[PDB]
Amino acid sequence: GPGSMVEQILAEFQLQEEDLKKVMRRMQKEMDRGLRLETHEEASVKMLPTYVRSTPEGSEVGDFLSLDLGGTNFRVMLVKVGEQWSVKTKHQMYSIPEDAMTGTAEMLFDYISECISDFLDKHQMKHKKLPLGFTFSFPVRHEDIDKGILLNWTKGFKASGAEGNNVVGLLRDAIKRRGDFEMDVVAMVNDTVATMISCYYEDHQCEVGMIVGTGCNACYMEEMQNVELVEGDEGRMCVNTEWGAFGDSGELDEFLLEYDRLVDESSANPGQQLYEKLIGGKYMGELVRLVLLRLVDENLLFHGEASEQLRTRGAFETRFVSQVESDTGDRKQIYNILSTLGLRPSTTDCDIVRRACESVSTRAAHMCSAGLAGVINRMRESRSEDVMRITVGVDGSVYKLHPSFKERFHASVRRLTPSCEITFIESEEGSGRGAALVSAVACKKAC
Ligand SMILES: COc1ccc2nc(NC(=O)[C@H](CC3CCCC3)c3ccc(S(=O)(=O)N4CCN(C)CC4)cc3)sc2n1
Ligand SMILES: OC[C@H]1O[C@H](O)[C@H](O)[C@@H](O)[C@@H]1O
Numbered sequence: 001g002p003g004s005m006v007e008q009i010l011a012e013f014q015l016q017e018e019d020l021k022k023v024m025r026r027m028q029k030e031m032d033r034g035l036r037l038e039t040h041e042e043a044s045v046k047m048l049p050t051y052v053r054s055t056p057e058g059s060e061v062g063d064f065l066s067l068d069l070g071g072t073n074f075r076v077m078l079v080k081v082g083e084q085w086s087v088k089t090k091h092q093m094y095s096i097p098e099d100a101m102t103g104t105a106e107m108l109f110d111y112i113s114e115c116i117s118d119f120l121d122k123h124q125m126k127h128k129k130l131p132l133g134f135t136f137s138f139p140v141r142h143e144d145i146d147k148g149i150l151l152n153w154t155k156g157f158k159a160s161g162a163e164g165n166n167v168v169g170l171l172r173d174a175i176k177r178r179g180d181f182e183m184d185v186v187a188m189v190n191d192t193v194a195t196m197i198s199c200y201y202e203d204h205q206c207e208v209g210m211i212v213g214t215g216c217n218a219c220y221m222e223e224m225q226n227v228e229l230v231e232g233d234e235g236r237m238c239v240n241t242e243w244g245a246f247g248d249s250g251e252l253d254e255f256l257l258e259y260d261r262l263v264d265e266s267s268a269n270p271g272q273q274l275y276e277k278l279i280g281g282k283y284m285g286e287l288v289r290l291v292l293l294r295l296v297d298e299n300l301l302f303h304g305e306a307s308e309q310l311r312t313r314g315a316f317e318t319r320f321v322s323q324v325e326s327d328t329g330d331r332k333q334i335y336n337i338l339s340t341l342g343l344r345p346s347t348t349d350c351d352i353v354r355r356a357c358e359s360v361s362t363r364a365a366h367m368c369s370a371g372l373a374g375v376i377n378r379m380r381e382s383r384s385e386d387v388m389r390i391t392v393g394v395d396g397s398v399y400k401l402h403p404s405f406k407e408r409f410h411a412s413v414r415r416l417t418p419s420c421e422i423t424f425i426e427s428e429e430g431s432g433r434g435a436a437l438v439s440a441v442a443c444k445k446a447c
């Protein structure tokens with residue numbers, strides 16, 4: 001409105017502790033709703049049972065394959081477990097073409113199967129039939145540890161014939177059509193789950209997995225008596241919260257800003273994954289772009305004139321946000337970004353662009369922290385210890401590559417979780433290694 005000022009505009013992103021506690025308590029309410037049989041179907045946070053349990057008592061050595069499929073690339077990993085346990089891995093990255101991102105799920109899996117076939121050829125692992133763990137970074141309703149149907153794509157990925165289908169069967173069918181090799185798919189897990197398992201290997205206190213990358217989600221070990229969707233009260237079972245859909249029932253309405261509505265309105269999945277849209281690297285850069293456009297329309301930035309690039313959706317990558325915030329103080333990192341976008345920025349413009357990035361990324365960290373606090377505080381209600389010692393495994397480009405996200409996030413989480421001694425583990429290739437590690441236990445369990 002009238003009298004607009006840079007600080008006043010960027011201040012809209014602030015979230016006071018009372019705001020974070022309110023977000024946190026609402027997340028806990030939605031988590032309870034997704035866990036109970038009565039409200040599950042209408043719950044925004046699905047709390048999907050993963051069928052990964054705490055009870056198996058043994059594992060085994062051997063060679064295990066891992067497939068890790070996200071929204072743009074995928075990697076194959078060969079994990080060798082030997083002997084105390086010794087774990088050695090090899091891997092290869094692949095990128096899904098175009099006659100895929102728009103094509104059928106069958107086309108997608110055929111390409112993935114061709115890639116796995118080539119990987120095994122190159123490592124002379126064709127003769128031996130290997131077990132494969134599958135990390136699939138999308139919402140899946142599991143029927144067992146190796147059976148789940150895709151509920152819906154997220155993060156703007158698409159491929160017809162996938163939603164409503166058993167993802168494992170899709171991979172199995174494709175491996176079949178290739179017919180030049182055998183492979184047993186022994187488990188399919190979400191990337192949050194694989195990440196928690198890869199960290200659990202190194203630290204058994206790890207019972208929470210989290211991802212802050214293209215998307216944002218979390219899994220944690222819940223008491224079986226609380227998982228109403230699976231008969232039994234013995235032990236714990238990992239639950240994939242799919243908390244990115246938090247707010248999809250209106251729970252965040254009072255916090256949403258115009259920039260958030262615009263990002264949602266123009267996204268590939270309007271009205272869905274609203275919490276994730278406040279945090280995820282898929283949306284962070286676009287949020288900063290809308291904020292910068294607002295500043296120029298108010299004649300507070302670039303003397304009111306934006307460039308063609310700046311005015312096209314997706315032009316401000318989250319990678320750019322991270323680079324802006326890494327600036328040493330001389331504006332070179334910032335200038336390198338703006339100049340490449342067709343802008344002739346002043347030193348002041350650069351400083352304004354940095355404060356805008358900080359406003360958006362700080363809000364992401366704070367929103368994300370209320371979610372994690374909600375998970376950790378809930379868990380603490382099932383332990384008799386005064387101080388709960390818990391380890392959170394985390395993966396994701398925002399958490400790992402953004403200059404100061406990690407620290408803001410950690411600090412905010414800690415302020416909201418008294419009586420909890422939290423250790424954060426930044427996972428290295430966990431999404432992929434966790435799938436292989438769970439396969440060894442699943443293979444041993446199946447004798
Ligand atoms: C076969 O069908 C089924 C059914 C249920 C099930 N649950 C499983 N659970 C596991 O594999 C559990 C899940 C953990 C999450 C936190 C609590 C325990 C698991 C336990 C231990 C690890 S591990 O410590 O990473 N590790 C893997 C490598 N081997 C050589 C040593 C042990 C990895 C996974 S496998 C399985 N298979
Ligand atoms: O990859 C991070 C996350 O992205 C989205 O939120 C997906 O829906 C979820 O499954 C995943 O875990």
Ligand code: NA
Nearest residue numbers: 224227230232
């Ligand atoms: Na149960």
